[PDB]
Amino acid sequence: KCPLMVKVLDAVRGSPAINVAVHVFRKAADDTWEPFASGKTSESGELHGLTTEEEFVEGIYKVEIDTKSYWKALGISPFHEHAEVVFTANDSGPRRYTIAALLSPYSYSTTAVVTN
Amino acid sequence: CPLMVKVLDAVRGSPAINVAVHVFRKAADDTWEPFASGKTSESGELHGLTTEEEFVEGIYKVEIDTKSYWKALGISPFHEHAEVVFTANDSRRYTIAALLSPYSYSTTAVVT
Amino acid sequence: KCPLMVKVLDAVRGSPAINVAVHVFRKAADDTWEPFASGKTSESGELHGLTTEEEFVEGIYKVEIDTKSYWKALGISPFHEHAEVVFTANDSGPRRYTIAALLSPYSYSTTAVVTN
Amino acid sequence: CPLMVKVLDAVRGSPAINVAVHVFRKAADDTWEPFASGKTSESGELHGLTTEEEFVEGIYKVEIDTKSYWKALGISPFHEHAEVVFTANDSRRYTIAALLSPYSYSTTAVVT
Ligand SMILES: C[C@@H](CON=C1c2ccccc2-c2ccccc21)C(=O)O
Ligand SMILES: C[C@@H](CON=C1c2ccccc2-c2ccccc21)C(=O)O
Numbered sequence A, C: 001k002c003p004l005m006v007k008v009l010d011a012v013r014g015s016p017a018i019n020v021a022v023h024v025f026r027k028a029a030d031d032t033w034e035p036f037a038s039g040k041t042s043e044s045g046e047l048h049g050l051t052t053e054e055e056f057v058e059g060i061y062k063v064e065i066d067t068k069s070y071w072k073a074l075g076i077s078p079f080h081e082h083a084e085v086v087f088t089a090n091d092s093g094p095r096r097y098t099i100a101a102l103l104s105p106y107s108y109s110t111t112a113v114v115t116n
Numbered sequence B, D: 001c002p003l004m005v006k007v008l009d010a011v012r013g014s015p016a017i018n019v020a021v022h023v024f025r026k027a028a029d030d031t032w033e034p035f036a037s038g039k040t041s042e043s044g045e046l047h048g049l050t051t052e053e054e055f056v057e058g059i060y061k062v063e064i065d066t067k068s069y070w071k072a073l074g075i076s077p078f079h080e081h082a083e084v085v086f087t088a089n090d091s092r093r094y095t096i097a098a099l100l101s102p103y104s105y106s107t108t109a110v111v112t
Helices: A067-073 B066-072 C067-073 D066-072
Strands: A004-010 A021-027 A033-040 A059-065 A080-089 A096-104 A107-115 B003-009 B020-026 B032-039 B058-064 B079-088 B094-101 B104-111 C004-010 C021-027 C033-040 C059-065 C080-089 C096-104 C107-115 D003-009 D020-026 D032-039 D058-064 D079-088 D094-101 D104-111
Touching: A004 A059, A067 A080, A067 A096, A080 A096, A080 A107, B003 B020, B003 B058, B066 B079, B066 B094, B079 B094, B079 B104, C004 C059, C067 C080, C067 C096, C080 C096, C080 C107, D003 D020, D003 D058, D066 D079, D066 D094, D079 D094, D079 D104
Parallel strands: A004 A096, B003 B094, C004 C096, D003 D094
Antiparallel strands: A021 A033, A021 A059, A059 A080, A080 D079, A096 A107, A107 D104, B020 B032, B020 B058, B058 B079, B079 C080, B094 B104, B104 C107, C021 C033, C021 C059, C059 C080, C096 C107, D020 D032, D020 D058, D058 D079, D094 D104
């Protein structure tokens, strides 16, 4: 299985958010953010294949979603620079994580679905 | 003010102004009687709907006319309206807040 | 394809909302709500097979999600009686509709994803 | 009050009380300088963070300590915290509102 997936929806058009840039970081032993994985959502607004179970070890992760470039190419000037989701992962063994974000120019919501 | 309504616009980051709101009480025959109504003010709020005397235990529906709000802004919406249905009992002050987007809304109750 | 699907998530547990009752109605020519379809979300919190393209004609629909029974069997007394989503469908030809609801005891959110 | 914070609890339908909030300004070297902080009051609100003089154009991050809030209630949360990152420019009053659930939060900006 694929342990980390990202799903993005547009709440203005009622559609997947397509071609949204995503960057994932893991908190360093030295207290800082190391690049972990990056990608772009597809035509269904999903991003698969960021990591593997082997490489996705315990840690603190930050999933940064580049909402402002997205809204920009649609002629919108949004409030947020981006949407960042920060969470501890795999601290009681391996899990599968989907991080969904719902986007509006001045609002966004994010929910995590974690299965075992 | 036992019952207040607060509407926001997630496209523009602003109160949602002049939104028609209709409130209904469920009658014993299972249908909705009009109870209160109004339009949101400049701060997206609607106060003075009921009084403590009249706001007795029961099932109330609050209906927010979101489709007109979007239509007047030139934006095409998904929902006919947004409806919030709950039971008021005595075991407070109720704020019903709604956050609007054309294809998405949320609603939260703040009970204090 | 399957023209109307419902997806329900629990925002307290970060999981699909399983065994959630859903009732769909269509607005009558005589101004009232006729029963159109009903079902229960599965282990992924999805409900498929409510209708067919042939039977899913233009109209106004109401998708009622029985949030209070759900929260009740988990020992929670929620605010809402249910979550109802009301929308015009297929008014410019057939579409596919997913109605997602996100649920918390005093809050819920619903978004529609409409594709063609 | 150029910048205000409003936190709500979606599990209990109540303001989120005594939530630590830290605000940062981005420094020219690309790092976050502490700027303002406080705890939400009984009505889930935090006022008096800055003044108009000090709140100049720039990128600000607001960080809401949601994990402590849930931990103190005996409920296990998903996020380390909730962060809102935006640019303040002069082309207002900013309310940053956050609606919290253990595995889900939303944030909306009301700019008037
Ligand atoms: C996304 C959530 C958040 O609600 N946002 C609120 C909100 C946003 C800006 C200013 C005041 C409020 C407020 C007051 C009482 C209850 C909720 C709010 C929703 O409206 O469902
Ligand atoms: C906060 C928004 C977001 O919806 N979340 C979705 C969501 C979250 C996790 C996995 C799949 C989905 C999905 C698929 C189709 C449409 C919506 C979603 C809501 O559910 O109201």
